[PDB]
Amino acid sequence: XXXXXXXXXXXXXXXXXXXXXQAERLAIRSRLKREYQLQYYDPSRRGVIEDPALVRWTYARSANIYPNFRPNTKTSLLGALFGIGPLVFWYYVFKTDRDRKEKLIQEGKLDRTFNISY
Amino acid sequence: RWQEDPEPEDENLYEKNPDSHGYDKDPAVDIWNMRVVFFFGFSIVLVLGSTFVAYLPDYRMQEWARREAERLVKYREAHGLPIMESNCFDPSKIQLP
Amino acid sequence: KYIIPTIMLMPLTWLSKNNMIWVNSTAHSLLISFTSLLLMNQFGDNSLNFSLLFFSDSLSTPLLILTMWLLPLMLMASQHHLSKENLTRKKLFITMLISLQLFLIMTFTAMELILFYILFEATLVPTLIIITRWGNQTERLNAGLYFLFYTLAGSLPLLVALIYIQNTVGSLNFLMLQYWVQPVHNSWSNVFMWLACMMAFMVKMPLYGLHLWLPKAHVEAPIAGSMVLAAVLLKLGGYGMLRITLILNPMTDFMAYPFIMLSLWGMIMTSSICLRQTDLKSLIAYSSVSHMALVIVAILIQTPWSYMGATALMIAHGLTSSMLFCLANSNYERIHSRTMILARGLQTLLPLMATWWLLASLTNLALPPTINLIGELFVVMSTFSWSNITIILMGVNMVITALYSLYMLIMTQRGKYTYHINNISPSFTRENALMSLHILPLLLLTLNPKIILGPLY
Amino acid sequence: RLFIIKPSGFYDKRFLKLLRFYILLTGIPVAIGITLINVXXXXXXXXXXXXXXXXXXXXXXXXXXXX
Amino acid sequence: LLQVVRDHWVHVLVPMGFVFGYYLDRKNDEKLTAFRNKSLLYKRELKPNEEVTW
Amino acid sequence: XXXXXXXXXXXXXXXXXXXXXXXXXXXXXXXXXXXXXXXXXXXXXXXXXXXXXXXXXXXXXXXXXXXXXXXXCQEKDVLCMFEAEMQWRRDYKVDQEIVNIIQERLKACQQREGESHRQNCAKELEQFTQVVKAYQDRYXXXXXXXXXXXXXXXXXXXXXXXXXXXXXX
Amino acid sequence: XXXXXXXXXXXXXXXXXXXXXXXXXXPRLAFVGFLGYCSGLIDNAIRRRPVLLAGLHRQLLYITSFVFVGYYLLKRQDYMYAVRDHDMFSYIKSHXXXXXXXXXXXXXXXXXXX
């Protein structure tokens, strides 16, 4: 997704609220980096580190399936039309092609004379 | 409180107190198993088994049919007009309807 | 000749001393697998019966050889696991594989449907105990219950199906006797007769609907990776679809028409999910759905060309997916997590295993004629004789077949590995031997694929 | 001179040596397989006379190893 | 003699199990003696050997 | 030989009149390589053929003919059907490779003429069209996978069309 | 037949009809004999005793009991299947009108397309 102008450096102000906003971002950034620094720079470890953020990322798709979906609303029915719907779409495509083929075999032959495979 | 739950420890053979091995513990068991009988199946099933597969014992009339067809072609060409197929396994059937 | 030496593996593991075990179980199994190729391959015009109806001959089943091929291979990758625990526990879960091997031989050999059924569901019992134990991650039971309540819910209707046939039309038994079978008149009472025979094999051979049986079994790993090869054997273990469709219902293909359309959408939608997924084992689990979906399409066409592609794909997938799971196990034993993004680094840390990663991935695509080109392409050629529209849908699937393999490669072909400190030794002598024992049998099938596809070939 | 980038190599090169040693060990019957066509006669096309239908090998053409 | 018998005891059972399976499954043809000379497809008259082939 | 038709004889004779040059590059290389290793390969092949000496004749081709057709015996019984079903499958496997020989006759025509392609031959073109059309009607090619019991119904379907069309005219 | 008509009610084996000849060293008897040995393996799992295979030699009692009862049990199996067939063949012979014979046909069947 893209707008009329690409967002990279558009609309920026110093102010007072924005100055403290960058201070909030660096506070968590440095906190999570130092616990990595204490784990990386020692020979006593030998192994793969866990990281709680990455495990929760995999847990977002593998789990949290049935805890969700409790508000179905009209959004779930629209997804059903995009799933079960296209299965019924080809039913009026493959049958019409087969009825076109079956009529040709009995009357007015269309199949090639040099055909033997299957 | 966990009491007795904490017991998990990382374990790897790698090279330490093993030199170069695949089997866990004992150098005598490793050499005789992981390199001898592990590769004996590599020599009998793969190398000596390559002679079979489909090559040698004919395998469901693949080579037999070629010799059978050629003699039937030359016989039917000299005497008859129709080549092989005309009426397959049908000679005087007792009506239809 | 086949059964009895397989049964003698049970007293072999128990009588042998605690220091050995693994040496005896692997070496003795390899010489029995050599003798299976020695005798079973011989056949005439129509394959003549072996002996009395207990275990019979093979007509269109070179798939028994694959079970004999994995017979030692289901012990090689499980060596990294089980070693930490008790010596009695080691012997138990080798004998559960022996029991699996005992029942899996019986399914493919015995030319039956009545006694075949009590061997079809009999494979589920040893695998259940295998899955419900040794699982490193949780939800073993949310996969173990789903393992049975998908299969047994569909397969128990065979009791009301198969017995109903033999009570009216002679007897099922030999299949070589089965020419008493008259074509079905096609009525509303005959609908549930066809469905009950199909729904049993609609679960083991995964579609678009009722397909969630398979990913739960793969993601929640039983033991290491060698038991996942037995889960591949269960997919091809439902081979009776080759036998039922040809013999029991020859005139019935009008009711097959909606089931082809279900499996046709189980090719685009099953492949699309197999792209953005996190787990390395899951990206093999969903590609195995679509690869076995190709076989289900081929069966329901009933053309002589399609069965050639069907029988080929049973052996093709049985040694390519199992090869991919061994590569997934080799990363699971070092990194201790099945995450694709975290476990990143080939060639730099794994120099020789990366070439095995390439050969396994490209075999999913249509390479120079190994087995998958004789497998996949034969089905696509046969679908055009059914309907002209098929290749428009089937061609899109051929694009995403690369998107299973290459996405598994690229997301591991980055030589960063900043967070990872483990995986010092690239591969043990047994670990590299596993990778060779899967591809090199397929490389020998390049010369003669007659023993890879043979229903009247 | 430089120390350069290091790989494992020792585990890698050994497997290829251990693989080929067992190919060469069963490479002897491959060499005998060539001489079986050379020394012993393969097959000749001839019409069968009514005396014996099958003896040792029933019907096999090409290669003595087939019989 | 003492070194081989004590160490190996289970190792002999598997190849001997194949021979035991080879003997048992072959002898089942003696139960099915019907159609040996009858039905002309591979039928041949005996000259020296008894009942063609087992 | 015998079964395969092909061309009778090829001409192939060089004149070489225009320009002296170094005779011909094609002719000089042909004479040189014939004695270089082609003569040694012919000598080695003759040395191995003579070394065989004793050779087995062998039966090769098996007989087994007719033994009652499938469209003569009826009713579901294993004693009569099994011999009949083996006969039909024998014919079907041979007829798969009968077409292959006729197909290879058309393959031989394409190369030998080249520029003519469809302008000449005609005999191989007519032979292929007659067999394949007969193979399509009689030996399944439309009636699912191979079955001897279903083949009699396929023959009855073609016989019903012949009886209905001729009665009207 | 479930209800007795010719056979004597409450029998030790059969006694009314003895001529049938029981199986000698049958494959069916070997499986019941295997279960007798198998029962003498899992008994040491209940009462914790060293070695299931090379433990107590009271296993001979377990093998013999399965063989002795199994031989009598299989003798009834051969007897009951014989009576079931004997009454079946007698029903066809006495009535004749219930059974019908048909051989040799030339009937048309519907052929499948594709």
From Swiss-Prot, chain A:
Protein's cellular compartments: Mitochondrion inner membrane
Cellular compartments per GO CC: mitochondrial inner membrane; mitochondrion; respiratory chain complex I
Taxonomic superkingdom: Eukaryota
Keywords per UniProt: Acetylation, Electron transport, Membrane, Mitochondrion, Mitochondrion inner membrane, Phosphoprotein, Respiratory chain, Transmembrane, Transmembrane helix, Transport
Membrane spanning stretches: 75-94
Main location (coarse class): mitochondrion
Record membrane topology: Single-pass membrane protein
Protein name: NADH dehydrogenase [ubiquinone] 1 beta subcomplex subunit 4
Organism: Bos taurus (Bovine)
From Swiss-Prot, chain B:
Residues spanning the membrane: 36-56
Entry's Gene Ontology cellular component terms: mitochondrial inner membrane; mitochondrion; respiratory chain complex I
Broad class of the protein's primary localization: mitochondrion
Cell compartment(s), UniProt: Mitochondrion inner membrane
Region of interest (Disordered), ranges: 1-24
Residue spans of biased composition, Basic and acidic residues class: 13-24
Keywords for the protein's UniProt record, in alphabetical order: Electron transport, Membrane, Mitochondrion, Mitochondrion inner membrane, Respiratory chain, Transit peptide, Transmembrane, Transmembrane helix, Transport
Membrane topology (UniProt): Single-pass membrane protein
Family note: Belongs to the complex I NDUFB11 subunit family.
Subunit composition and interactions: Complex I is composed of 45 different subunits. Interacts with BCAP31.
Primary role: Accessory subunit of the mitochondrial membrane respiratory chain NADH dehydrogenase (Complex I), that is believed not to be involved in catalysis. Complex I functions in the transfer of electrons from NADH to the respiratory chain. The immediate electron acceptor for the enzyme is believed to be ubiquinone.
Protein name according to UniProt: NADH dehydrogenase [ubiquinone] 1 beta subcomplex subunit 11, mitochondrial
Organism: Bos taurus
Region of the whole protein represented: 54 to 150 of 154
UniProtKB/Swiss-Prot annotation, chain E:
Biological role: Accessory subunit of the mitochondrial membrane respiratory chain NADH dehydrogenase (Complex I) that is believed not to be involved in catalysis. Complex I functions in the transfer of electrons from NADH to the respiratory chain. The immediate electron acceptor for the enzyme is believed to be ubiquinone.
Family that this chain belongs to: Belongs to the complex I NDUFB1 subunit family.
Principal place of residence: mitochondrion
Protein name per Swiss-Prot or TrEMBL: NADH dehydrogenase [ubiquinone] 1 beta subcomplex subunit 1
UniProt key word Lipid biosynthesis: no
Compartments it resides in: Mitochondrion inner membrane
Keyword Electron transport: yes
InterPro entries per record: NDUB1
Superkingdom of origin: Eukaryota
UniProt keywords, alphabetically: Electron transport, Membrane, Mitochondrion, Mitochondrion inner membrane, Respiratory chain, Transmembrane, Transmembrane helix, Transport
Record-level GO cellular component terms: mitochondrial inner membrane; mitochondrion; respiratory chain complex I
Membrane topology: Single-pass membrane protein
Residues spanning the membrane: 8-24
Subunit structure: Complex I is composed of 45 different subunits.
Swiss-Prot record, chain G:
Signal sequence annotation: none
Compartments where located: Mitochondrion inner membrane
Main location: mitochondrion
UniProt entry tagged with the keyword Cell inner membrane: no
Record-annotated membrane-spanning stretches: 55-74
Source species, domain of life: Eukaryota
Keyword Transport (UniProt): yes
Listed GO biological process terms: mitochondrial electron transport, NADH to ubiquinone; mitochondrial respiratory chain complex I assembly
PTM (free text): There is a minor unacetylated form of subunit B14.5b.
Protein function: Accessory subunit of the mitochondrial membrane respiratory chain NADH dehydrogenase (Complex I), that is believed not to be involved in catalysis but required for the complex assembly. Complex I functions in the transfer of electrons from NADH to the respiratory chain. The immediate electron acceptor for the enzyme is believed to be ubiquinone.
Assembly mode: Complex I is composed of 45 different subunits. Interacts with TMEM242.
Family: Belongs to the complex I NDUFC2 subunit family.
Identification of the protein by name: NADH dehydrogenase [ubiquinone] 1 subunit C2
Species annotation: Bos taurus (Bovine)
Gene: NDUFC2
From-to range in the entire protein, with total length: 29 to 96 of 120
